[PDB]
Write a protein that binds this DNA or RNA. Structure first.
Ligand SMILES: [Mg+2]
Ligand SMILES: [Mg+2]
Ligand SMILES: [Mg+2]
Ligand SMILES: [Mg+2]
Ligand SMILES: [Mg+2]
Ligand SMILES: [Mg+2]
Ligand SMILES: [Mg+2]
Ligand SMILES: [Mg+2]
Ligand SMILES: [Mg+2]
Ligand SMILES: [Mg+2]
Ligand SMILES: [Mg+2]
Ligand SMILES: [Mg+2]
Ligand SMILES: [Mg+2]
Ligand SMILES: [Mg+2]
Ligand SMILES: [Mg+2]
Ligand SMILES: [Mg+2]
Ligand SMILES: [Mg+2]
Ligand SMILES: [Mg+2]
Ligand SMILES: [Mg+2]
Ligand SMILES: [Mg+2]
Ligand SMILES: [Mg+2]
Ligand SMILES: [Mg+2]
Ligand SMILES: [Mg+2]
Ligand SMILES: [Mg+2]
Ligand SMILES: [Mg+2]
Ligand SMILES: [Mg+2]
Ligand SMILES: [Mg+2]
Ligand SMILES: [Mg+2]
Ligand SMILES: [Mg+2]
Ligand SMILES: [Mg+2]
Ligand SMILES: [Mg+2]
Ligand SMILES: [Mg+2]
Ligand SMILES: [Mg+2]
Ligand SMILES: [Mg+2]
Ligand SMILES: [Mg+2]
Ligand SMILES: [Mg+2]
Ligand SMILES: [Mg+2]
Ligand SMILES: [Mg+2]
Ligand SMILES: [Mg+2]
Ligand SMILES: [Mg+2]
Ligand SMILES: [Mg+2]
Ligand SMILES: [Mg+2]
Ligand SMILES: [Mg+2]
Ligand SMILES: [Mg+2]
Ligand SMILES: [Mg+2]
Ligand SMILES: [Mg+2]
Ligand SMILES: [Mg+2]
Ligand SMILES: [Mg+2]
Ligand SMILES: [Mg+2]
Ligand SMILES: [Mg+2]
Ligand SMILES: [Mg+2]
Ligand SMILES: [Mg+2]
Ligand SMILES: [Mg+2]
Ligand SMILES: [Mg+2]
Ligand SMILES: [Mg+2]
Ligand SMILES: [Mg+2]
Ligand SMILES: [Mg+2]
Ligand SMILES: [Mg+2]
Ligand SMILES: [Mg+2]
Ligand SMILES: [Mg+2]
Ligand SMILES: [Mg+2]
Ligand SMILES: [Mg+2]
Ligand SMILES: [Mg+2]
Ligand SMILES: [Mg+2]
Ligand SMILES: [Mg+2]
Lengths: 54, 100, 146, 62, 23
RNA sequence: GGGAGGGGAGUGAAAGAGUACCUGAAACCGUGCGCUUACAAUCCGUCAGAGCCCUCGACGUGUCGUGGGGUGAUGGCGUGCC
RNA sequence: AUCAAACUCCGUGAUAGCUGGUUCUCCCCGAAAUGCAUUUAGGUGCAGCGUCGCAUGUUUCUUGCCGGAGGUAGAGCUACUG
RNA sequence: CGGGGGAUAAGCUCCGUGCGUCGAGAGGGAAACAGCCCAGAUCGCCGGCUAAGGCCCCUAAGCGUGUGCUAAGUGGAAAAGG
RNA sequence: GAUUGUGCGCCGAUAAUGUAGCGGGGCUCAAGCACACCGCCGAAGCCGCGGCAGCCAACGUGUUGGCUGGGUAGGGGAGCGUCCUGCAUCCGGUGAAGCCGCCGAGUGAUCGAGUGGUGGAGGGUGUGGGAGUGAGAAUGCAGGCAUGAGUAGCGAUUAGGCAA
RNA sequence: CAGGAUAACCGCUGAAAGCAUCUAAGCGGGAAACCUCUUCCAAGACCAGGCUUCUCACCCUCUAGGAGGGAUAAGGCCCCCC
């Protein structure tokens, strides 16, 4: 089918707001003498140096 | 000590040394005008007899002439094509009571 | 201009009304008028000016006629064929206060002002009440001769 | 407001207005209301005046 | 039917003096 | 900084004139600031109407005044246009 | 890509008793859905009903009184037809 | 209101009425309801007096006064008959 | 005991979504019905005060007085705004034209030679003449932009994986 | 199953109305019909229920009226193997 009427601006914005993204957590890891932040999901990779860091 | 004054077919409660908005009455600014009386309250005594009320008098001083807020009028009916426009403003006078 | 109520000029009070051998209509009318505060000379429709009320001994309410079995209080849950009914006698037997609460609720405006107002009422069944620490003032229904 | 004040002062609004009319005092409902909210003593005095001015029997065929 | 009887009967209110549009 | 693109310093009256370059409105999308709303049945306005905030005077710490502005808790009324 | 008579330019702004739309303001006055006629009934001509002006201007309307003819309501039948 | 067509049916149709209203008419009254009752909007006023209808609360005004009826929620749906 | 006439009454009573045939709460300690009496609320009606307009009389070179002031189609009269022009004038790189505010003003279409920011090159008043001279709707047209929407799909019948 | 109050019906005591009558005062029996009794949901039931255990303490700022910000305990959450 099809919609009948143009919804209100307030309704549109209210429905739109919930659509977003969430930031992940960070952890401190020390490699080669300096501290840099990486997600906990990559702790072992960072420790063993298998992940490149810019 | 306060009394009641009749003016322009209506009444306003007023005490000594007060200012009220009253409908325009022919009088040169700066002069004094006498007004009738309606009721008098003094302490615990109340004067209500018509003869005493008539005998008592009110004196006040006219300050200036002022015009009220503007108001816009429209007439409208549905499915007629009738549209009417009309503006209007009212004239007011500001006075200060002197003694009663 | 006409007088209007300020932020903190309002004052409330505590009232108690007995319900021993009294007619429900009169009791409800008195309660409604007291809740609304029509008696107080500081009435203004937009802001409540009501006064607290206490009702005691609801079970002794007297009702005339055969209403004990010919008057029915209805309500419906919402699903199809869910309209079930109860009689005033059973209502008094089970929940003494429900009848008076419903009567007073119906005796008041149904807007949200009245919705907030109905908070002002407390109704009890026994002859006692734990609200004795606030010194309620006894009240009596009277007629002004004219 | 006037009805509430009169009922508090133990007299009906209709009889109060009848007494005012009989006494021939022409003050207006706004004045009575403002006075009642402001001067209960004055309101009581006016009510007493009206009651005194009331006729003997309100039920008489006159 | 029931619908018809109502409006004609409701016309007998003393407010309208008994005469109303559409019976 | 890969570029695209941008910041200083200069050109010039202006760079609110930077080849997408006069004057730059409305639909449209914004960031910051002030007020209000999570027990509510509204052709979404009006008449009343507390609180809060901004302001103009006189008087002092805030209180009135022939004072203005924005917000509006709450009551009455209310069946779009051709 | 369309056929109970293809497509393009012109006659050509083909023609409709038919459906649709026609915008800035105020002051004064203020209608009908009736009769007659019509290859006529959802069309249209005339009359009545409105407005502006010109001319005679109470000739308009209500009440009282007076002079007037009707054949209904009712009622009646050896007064006629049943 | 007085009539015809109709099954003495329709919110049906066709007539006549110095007849009312709506149509081209806001307010108040009957919950809502153009055609019913009162009442004809030049504009402003935080003034008085009233028609129709109302005066337990919703909702402004009398749980008015005096004399009588009601046992049926008749009040707040209708006939032959008992 | 019966027939007589009267005011109230009872039975006769039964359709489909949820009491639903007093508006609700509720009312026979009538707030139900009949007859008298006294009062009150109740509009844009009338009265009171004031502003404007039309017709008419009086006297006057506009004061007073008497009536009226709703309208669809329709008739008559009187007006605002925009452009180009004849004539006579004034403003302007010491800032002219539009745009966005504040403050005000006329009974209307609106006005401000009163003030603030942007801009840079022509404008206003008075009295005549001529208008392509005034938008909301015709399933109107040219250009730009809203929702469904960050939803469906990403166009087969084989299928990729690994080291560099 | 069992219990409570009922419709149709069956009754006991009884004047109005010396008798009689299940009635106008009262008292009783009487069904898959109604209320508890079976299973499940349920304190957003705004009267927002009830009984228990755990911590019940560290700062800064605006200006001391409250509020805001930072650091903690009880607990909870994120990520991980299922
Ligand atoms: Mg009929
Ligand atoms: Mg330069
Ligand atoms: Mg461009
Ligand atoms: Mg540009
Ligand atoms: Mg809230
Ligand atoms: Mg509602
Ligand atoms: Mg409304
Ligand atoms: Mg409504
Ligand atoms: Mg052919
Ligand atoms: Mg071809
Ligand atoms: Mg030709
Ligand atoms: Mg051609
Ligand atoms: Mg053609
Ligand atoms: Mg043609
Ligand atoms: Mg059409
Ligand atoms: Mg006319
Ligand atoms: Mg004809
Ligand atoms: Mg004559
Ligand atoms: Mg004759
Ligand atoms: Mg006959
Ligand atoms: Mg014969
Ligand atoms: Mg007839
Ligand atoms: Mg007939
Ligand atoms: Mg017809
Ligand atoms: Mg006809
Ligand atoms: Mg009319
Ligand atoms: Mg009307
Ligand atoms: Mg109405
Ligand atoms: Mg008028
Ligand atoms: Mg009156
Ligand atoms: Mg009357
Ligand atoms: Mg009242
Ligand atoms: Mg009564
Ligand atoms: Mg009697
Ligand atoms: Mg009935
Ligand atoms: Mg009958
Ligand atoms: Mg019979
Ligand atoms: Mg009889
Ligand atoms: Mg019955
Ligand atoms: Mg009712
Ligand atoms: Mg009038
Ligand atoms: Mg005139
Ligand atoms: Mg007019
Ligand atoms: Mg027209
Ligand atoms: Mg016209
Ligand atoms: Mg111009
Ligand atoms: Mg030009
Ligand atoms: Mg020059
Ligand atoms: Mg310049
Ligand atoms: Mg400049
Ligand atoms: Mg410039
Ligand atoms: Mg000229
Ligand atoms: Mg011209
Ligand atoms: Mg010409
Ligand atoms: Mg043109
Ligand atoms: Mg347009
Ligand atoms: Mg388009
Ligand atoms: Mg879309
Ligand atoms: Mg999808
Ligand atoms: Mg998909
Ligand atoms: Mg493909
Ligand atoms: Mg017996
Ligand atoms: Mg017996
Ligand atoms: Mg809770
Ligand atoms: Mg934890």
């Amino acid at each position: 089918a099809v919609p009948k009427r143009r919804m209100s601006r307030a309704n549109t914005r209210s429905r739109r707001a919930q659509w977003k993204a969430e930031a992940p957590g960070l952890v401190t890891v020390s490699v080669a003498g300096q501290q840099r932040k990486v997600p906990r999901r990559l702790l072992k990779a960072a420790r063993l140096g298998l992940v490149d860091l810019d | 000590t306060y009394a009641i004054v009749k003016t322009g077919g209506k009444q306003y409660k007023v005490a000594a040394g007060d200012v009220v908005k009253v409908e325009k009455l022919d009088s040169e600014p700066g002069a004094s005008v006498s007004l009738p009386v309606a009721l008098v309250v003094d302490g615990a005594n109340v004067t209500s007899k018509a003869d005493d009320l008539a005998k008592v008098a009110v004196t006040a001083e006219v300050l200036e002439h002022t015009k009220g807020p503007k108001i816009r009028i429209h007439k409208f009916k549905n499915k007629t094509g009738y549209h009417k426009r009309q503006g209007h403003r009212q004239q007011l006078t500001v006075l200060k009571v002197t003694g009663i | 201009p006409t007088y209007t109520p300020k932020a903190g000029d309002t004052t409330r009070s505590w009232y108690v009304i007995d319900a021993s051998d009294v007619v429900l209509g009169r009791l409800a009318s008195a309660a409604a008028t007291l809740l609304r505060g029509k008696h107080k000379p500081t009435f203004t429709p937009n802001v409540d000016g009501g006064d607290f009320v206490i009702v005691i001994n609801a079970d002794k309410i007297a009702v005339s006629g055969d209403k004990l079995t010919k008057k029915f209080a209805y309500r419906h849950s919402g699903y199809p064929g869910g309209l079930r009914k109860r009689t005033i006698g059973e209502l008094l037997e089970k929940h003494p206060t429900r009848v008076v609460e419903n009567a007073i609720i119906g005796m008041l405006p149904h807007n949200k002002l009245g919705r907030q107002i109905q908070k002002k009422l407390k109704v009890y069944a026994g002859p006692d009440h734990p609200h004795a620490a606030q010194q309620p003032i006894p009240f009596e229904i009277k007629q002004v001769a004219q | 407001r006037i009805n509430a004040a009169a009922r508090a002062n133990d007299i009906t609004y209709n009889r109060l207005i009848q007494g005012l009319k009989a006494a021939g005092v022409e003050v207006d409902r706004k004045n009575l209301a403002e006075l009642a909210v402001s001067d209960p003593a004055a309101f009581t005095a006016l009510v007493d005046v009206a009651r005194a001015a009331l006729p003997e029997d309100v039920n008489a065929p006159s | 039917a029931k619908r018809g009887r109502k409006k004609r009967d409701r016309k007998h209110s003393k407010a309208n003096h008994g005469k109303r549009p559409n019976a």
